[PDB]
Amino acid sequence: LTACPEESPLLVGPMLIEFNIPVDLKLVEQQNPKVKLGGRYTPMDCISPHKVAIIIPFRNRQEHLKYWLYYLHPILQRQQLDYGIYVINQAGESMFNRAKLLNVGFKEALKDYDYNCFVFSDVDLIPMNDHNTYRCFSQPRHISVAMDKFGFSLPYVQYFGGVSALSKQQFLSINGFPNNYWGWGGEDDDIYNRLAFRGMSVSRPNAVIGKCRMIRHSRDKKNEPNPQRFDRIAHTKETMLSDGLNSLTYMVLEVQRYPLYTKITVDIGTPS
Amino acid sequence: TELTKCKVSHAIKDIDGYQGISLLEWACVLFHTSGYDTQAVVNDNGSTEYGLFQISDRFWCKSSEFPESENICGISCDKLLDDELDDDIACAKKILAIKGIDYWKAYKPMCSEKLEQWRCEKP
Ligand SMILES: CC(=O)N[C@@H]1[C@@H](O)[C@H](O)[C@@H](CO)O[C@H]1O
Ligand SMILES: [Ca+2]
């Protein structure tokens, strides 16, 4: 009935994150009885001003998804967020397009509820401290600041990949993310460039609070490094006007509401 | 092996200043070029780039797939996939002298500003 406190009293701080034991969603659902169809949750204890759509780009990584759900659902409930989990599944065989799938997630999530914050997260990143809140701030937020892959450090100050959070306004302000980055690399840098061109700065928790684990995996022959990525990021200032939310097109092939999440399989076309 | 910035910086000391490129600039280039992975392999446009420096077999090193490239560096491309950086560095110097820094496409867009973060204070 009343607003949730600024900081949740349920936080535990650091957590052990391991990808050795096998996960069972049925057990996951059992442990998280408060999560509703489609992976929706809303605090019944207080009112959260954080209406968060968590968007996960995805293709053929059901096992990573299992761990993601096993670790995040309890964390997100502790953080007292009014959230929804959206897996944006790329149908087909073209190179993976992370940013386009995040754009899709943004539009589809809005059909479900009036979310005011969007967390974009790779399916293989898990936060090691629940103090790293999965929500939005006065400035665009970069959440995966100290990934084990980078030695629990931020690899470069312009890094905005992994997990990030933008309020609806911040996202609308940069015309969303690019749709033309096919294959691996650079799209997160393009997004970084967009935020800077729109007068915004990147906010981040410190290196201790932002520790994260990445489930490593074998190279994806379907996500080869994008040869045009270096040329593309040098032109964001001009291309963010013509490539983004305003030019997004795709076809929804299926919407599945599972107990722990919503999965939208989409046909996003091919490299033009 | 995925080296750390400081490990790479220390390994490439003797390239510092060559053709005007600093170690700060190189640490930055190498991170965005290979992610400091001495075993990185990227194959595209009919050629394959190798190691930390992503040296191409199109002109610089000799590979099985393209056995008659100019092999300007006079080295088998597989010598660019280990943790002994001396020959990688020697080849990169040749590229710097012949083609110049723009062989590395990461340099201009990612390493034209905010260079101080790339320093390794570790002796
Ligand atoms: C232009 C480019 O390749 N940028 C990549 C970026 O996409 C990636 O998220 C980051 C961490 O792996 O490393 C950068 O070098
Ligand atoms: Ca070598």
Side-chain angles (χ1 to χ4, degrees):
Chain A
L1 72 178
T2 189
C4 293
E6 226 286 353
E7 179 173 292
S8 164
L10 313 172
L11 284 30
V12 298
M15 306 169 285
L16 249 54
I17 305 302
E18 51 201 330
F19 312 116
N20 42 194
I21 303 178
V23 174
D24 169 271
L25 323 75
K26 236 320 184 68
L27 247 309
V28 180
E29 318 182 8
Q30 194 180 168
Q31 293 170 177
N32 297 273
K34 231 70 73 67
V35 169
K36 315 200 308 170
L37 228 192
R40 276 288 279 122
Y41 171 87
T42 305
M44 57 167 90
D45 261 350
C46 47
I47 298 186
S48 184
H50 310 304
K51 294 186 177 191
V52 191
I54 300 182
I55 299 155
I56 305 182
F58 179 89
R59 220 228 311 253
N60 192 28
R61 296 281 176 290
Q62 185 64 24
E63 285 301 315
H64 292 355
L65 221 208
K66 286 175 179 170
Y67 282 124
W68 194 91
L69 298 165
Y70 170 76
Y71 285 112
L72 279 301
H73 271 297
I75 292 166
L76 303 165
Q77 286 165 260
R78 229 176 281 144
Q79 293 179 354
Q80 298 185 139
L81 314 171
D82 171 19
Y83 69 94
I85 306 309
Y86 298 85
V87 176
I88 310 311
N89 176 46
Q90 186 173 319
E93 317 297 322
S94 301
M95 290 304 176
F96 194 67
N97 191 334
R98 184 180 174 268
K100 198 167 180 187
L101 299 162
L102 296 172
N103 275 337
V104 173
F106 175 84
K107 264 204 160 306
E108 298 290 311
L110 248 1
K111 292 168 178 190
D112 277 359
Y113 188 65
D114 211 81
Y115 296 109
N116 48 36
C117 172
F118 297 81
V119 169
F120 307 93
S121 171
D122 288 351
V123 69
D124 53 23
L125 291 177
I126 315 289
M128 296 171 75
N129 191 311
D130 61 10
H131 267 106
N132 193 351
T133 324
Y134 271 40
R135 57 90 167 179
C136 296
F137 295 69
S138 53
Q139 292 283 359
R141 183 84 163 183
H142 182 217
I143 295 167
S144 56
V145 309
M147 293 158 44
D148 49 9
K149 185 188 175 179
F150 302 119
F152 288 134
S153 297
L154 186 70
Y156 60 105
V157 82
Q158 310 99 315
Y159 181 59
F160 201 63
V163 185
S164 49
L166 286 67
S167 67
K168 177 155 167 186
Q169 280 178 40
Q170 282 152 14
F171 186 88
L172 261 358
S173 184
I174 58 172
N175 179 206
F177 307 154
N179 293 298
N180 301 148
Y181 281 76
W182 298 83
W184 185 91
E187 91 290 335
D188 46 325
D189 302 301
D190 184 277
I191 293 164
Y192 182 85
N193 287 350
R194 290 186 184 218
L195 307 175
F197 284 130
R198 284 307 177 274
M200 296 179 267
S201 63
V202 176
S203 173
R204 291 176 177 110
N206 67 225
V208 169
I209 291 162
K211 298 211 308 182
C212 290
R213 276 221 185 289
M214 178 182 278
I215 315 173
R216 285 287 205 158
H217 29 64
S218 303
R219 174 164 58 65
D220 188 350
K221 279 140 64 288
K222 294 192 172 184
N223 196 20
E224 291 287 305
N226 179 1
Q228 318 171 317
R229 75 183 181 289
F230 293 117
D231 296 310
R232 305 192 83 103
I233 62 193
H235 293 99
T236 307
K237 174 76 164 288
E238 312 102 78
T239 52
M240 60 185 292
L241 298 172
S242 53
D243 178 30
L245 230 200
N246 64 11
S247 71
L248 168 76
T249 65
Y250 60 96
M251 297 179 265
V252 178
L253 307 181
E254 191 189 330
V255 170
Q256 306 180 64
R257 306 293 195 166
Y258 277 117
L260 293 180
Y261 66 93
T262 293
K263 178 177 171 187
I264 313 171
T265 295
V266 291
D267 178 351
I268 57 174
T270 60
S272 53
Chain B
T1 304
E2 306 202 322
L3 303 179
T4 60
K5 176 176 72 191
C6 274
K7 187 52 186 301
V8 167
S9 291
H10 290 342
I12 62 170
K13 284 280 167 294
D14 209 13
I15 204 190
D16 180 28
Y18 193 71
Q19 218 52 46
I21 313 309
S22 75
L23 286 174
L24 299 188
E25 284 169 308
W26 269 117
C28 179
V29 170
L30 297 180
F31 176 82
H32 293 297
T33 289
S34 62
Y36 302 142
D37 184 349
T38 60
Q39 291 175 280
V41 177
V42 181
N43 172 286
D44 188 79
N45 195 195
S47 70
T48 307
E49 309 194 326
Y50 298 74
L52 180 62
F53 288 86
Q54 284 294 273
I55 290 159
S56 186
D57 66 346
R58 171 154 269 150
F59 302 119
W60 313 95
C61 58
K62 185 193 187 190
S63 71
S64 295
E65 5 213 56
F66 192 53
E68 203 177 72
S69 96
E70 271 72 8
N71 179 206
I72 296 169
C73 289
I75 183 186
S76 167
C77 300
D78 298 316
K79 288 294 196 166
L80 296 180
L81 296 172
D82 54 48
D83 292 349
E84 286 153 55
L85 280 23
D86 294 75
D87 54 8
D88 303 56
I89 298 169
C91 182
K93 273 191 84 173
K94 289 304 185 168
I95 293 168
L96 276 182
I98 298 165
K99 189 163 179 56
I101 191 63
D102 289 326
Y103 167 81
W104 290 277
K105 302 184 212 288
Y107 177 69
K108 191 153 209 321
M110 305 305 302
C111 311
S112 292
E113 50 156 23
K114 297 165 176 196
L115 288 186
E116 187 60 25
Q117 66 176 320
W118 301 101
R119 185 182 305 284
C120 163
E121 297 288 6
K122 180 174 176 164

